[PDB]
Protein backbone atom coordinates (compact mmCIF):
# COMPACT_ATOMS: atom_id res chain seq x y z
CA UNK A 1 0.00 0.00 0.00
CA UNK A 2 0.90 3.67 -0.29
CA UNK A 3 -0.22 6.61 1.83
CA UNK A 4 -0.96 10.10 0.45
CA UNK A 5 -0.63 13.82 1.07
CA UNK A 6 -3.19 16.39 -0.06
CA UNK A 7 -2.34 19.40 -2.22
CA UNK A 8 -3.88 22.48 -3.84
CA UNK A 9 -4.92 22.63 -7.47
CA UNK A 10 -4.30 23.01 -10.40
CA UNK A 11 -2.58 19.75 -9.74
CA UNK A 12 -4.97 17.02 -10.90
CA UNK A 13 -6.47 15.29 -7.89
CA UNK A 14 -4.29 12.32 -7.00
CA UNK A 15 -5.86 9.00 -6.05
CA UNK A 16 -5.01 6.31 -3.48
CA UNK A 17 -3.03 3.50 -5.08
CA UNK A 18 -2.40 -0.15 -4.35
CA UNK A 19 0.34 -2.60 -5.30
CA UNK A 20 0.08 -6.38 -5.55
CA UNK A 21 2.95 -8.80 -6.12
CA UNK A 22 3.59 -12.52 -6.48
CA UNK A 23 7.01 -14.14 -6.41
CA UNK A 24 8.02 -17.47 -7.92
CA UNK A 25 9.86 -20.08 -5.86
CA UNK A 26 13.29 -20.79 -7.33
CA UNK A 27 14.74 -24.24 -6.82
CA UNK A 28 18.26 -25.61 -6.24
CA UNK A 29 19.90 -28.81 -4.99
CA UNK A 30 23.06 -30.37 -3.52
CA UNK A 31 25.48 -33.19 -4.34
CA UNK A 32 27.93 -35.45 -2.52
CA UNK A 33 29.55 -38.82 -3.07
CA UNK A 34 30.44 -41.74 -0.87
CA UNK A 35 32.31 -44.27 -2.99
CA UNK A 36 33.35 -47.69 -1.73
CA UNK A 37 36.04 -50.07 -2.96
CA UNK A 38 35.74 -53.48 -4.57
CA UNK A 39 36.66 -55.57 -1.55
CA UNK A 40 34.86 -53.45 1.04
CA UNK A 41 31.53 -54.67 -0.32
CA UNK A 42 32.21 -58.35 0.30
CA UNK A 43 33.57 -57.80 3.82
CA UNK A 44 30.19 -56.51 4.93
CA UNK A 45 28.41 -59.34 3.13
CA UNK A 46 30.52 -62.35 4.06
CA UNK A 47 31.83 -63.32 0.64
CA UNK A 48 35.47 -62.90 1.71
CA UNK A 49 35.42 -64.08 5.32
CA UNK B 1 5.19 50.90 20.29
CA UNK B 2 8.69 52.29 20.45
CA UNK B 3 10.64 53.38 23.53
CA UNK B 4 12.72 56.54 23.62
CA UNK B 5 15.93 58.11 24.86
CA UNK B 6 16.53 61.77 25.67
CA UNK B 7 19.17 63.81 23.84
CA UNK B 8 21.05 67.11 24.00
CA UNK B 9 21.89 69.67 21.33
CA UNK B 10 22.40 69.94 18.50
CA UNK B 11 20.47 66.68 18.11
CA UNK B 12 16.79 67.35 17.39
CA UNK B 13 14.15 66.53 19.97
CA UNK B 14 12.48 63.23 19.18
CA UNK B 15 8.88 62.24 19.88
CA UNK B 16 7.18 58.98 20.89
CA UNK B 17 6.01 57.06 17.83
CA UNK B 18 3.34 54.45 17.24
CA UNK B 19 2.68 51.74 14.67
CA UNK B 20 -0.47 49.96 13.53
CA UNK B 21 -0.54 47.03 11.11
CA UNK B 22 -3.18 44.86 9.42
CA UNK B 23 -2.47 41.56 7.66
CA UNK B 24 -4.84 39.87 5.19
CA UNK B 25 -5.38 36.18 5.97
CA UNK B 26 -4.08 34.03 3.13
CA UNK B 27 -6.39 31.18 2.16
CA UNK B 28 -5.87 27.83 0.42
CA UNK B 29 -7.81 24.63 -0.18
CA UNK B 30 -7.08 20.93 -0.47
CA UNK B 31 -8.18 17.99 -2.60
CA UNK B 32 -8.12 14.19 -2.28
CA UNK B 33 -9.79 11.55 -4.42
CA UNK B 34 -11.53 8.37 -3.36
CA UNK B 35 -12.82 6.58 -6.45
CA UNK B 36 -14.74 3.33 -5.97
CA UNK B 37 -15.56 0.77 -8.68
CA UNK B 38 -18.71 -0.30 -10.49
CA UNK B 39 -19.27 -3.60 -8.66
CA UNK B 40 -18.53 -2.18 -5.21
CA UNK B 41 -21.62 0.04 -5.34
CA UNK B 42 -23.86 -3.00 -5.81
CA UNK B 43 -22.06 -4.78 -2.97
CA UNK B 44 -22.62 -2.03 -0.43
CA UNK B 45 -26.17 -1.43 -1.63
CA UNK B 46 -27.63 -4.94 -1.66
CA UNK B 47 -28.11 -5.52 -5.38
CA UNK B 48 -25.67 -8.46 -5.37
CA UNK B 49 -26.52 -10.30 -2.15
Residues whose CB falls within 8 Å of the CB of residue B39, separated by 6 or more in sequence, listed in order: B48
CA A37 to chain centroid: 37
Q: Quick check: B11 contacting A, CB < 8 Å? A: no
How far is C-alpha A5 from the geometric centre of its chain's CA atoms? 37
Nearest Cα residue in chain A from B33: A15
Experimental method reported for this structure:
cryo-EM
Return d(Cα A42, Cα A29) in angstroms, integer: 32
Number of C-beta neighbours around residue A23 at 10 A: 5
Determine the Cα–Cα distance for residues A40 and A14; give it in Å rounded to an integer: 77
Q: Which of B27, B30, B37 to mutate to test the interface with A (most CBs of A within 10 A)?
A: B30
- Cα maximum dimension of chain A: 97
Region of A30 on the Ramachandran plot (φ > 0 left; ψ -120 to 50 alpha; else beta): beta
Q: Is B31 helix (H, G, I), strand (E, B) or coil?
A: strand
Q: How far apart are CA B4 and CA B13, in angstroms?
A: 11
DSSP-derived secondary structure letter, A30: -
For residue A7, the cross-strand partners are B31
CA distance A7 to B43: 31
**Alpha-carbon A31 to chain mean position:** 18
- What are the backbone angles phi and psi of residue B47, rounded to the nearest 5°? -75, -5
Q: How many Cβ atoms are within 10 Å of A13's Cβ, its own excluded? A: 13
End-to-end CA distance of chain B: 72
Amino acid sequence: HQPLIARDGPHPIEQPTHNYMTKIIDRRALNAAFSLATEAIALLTGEAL
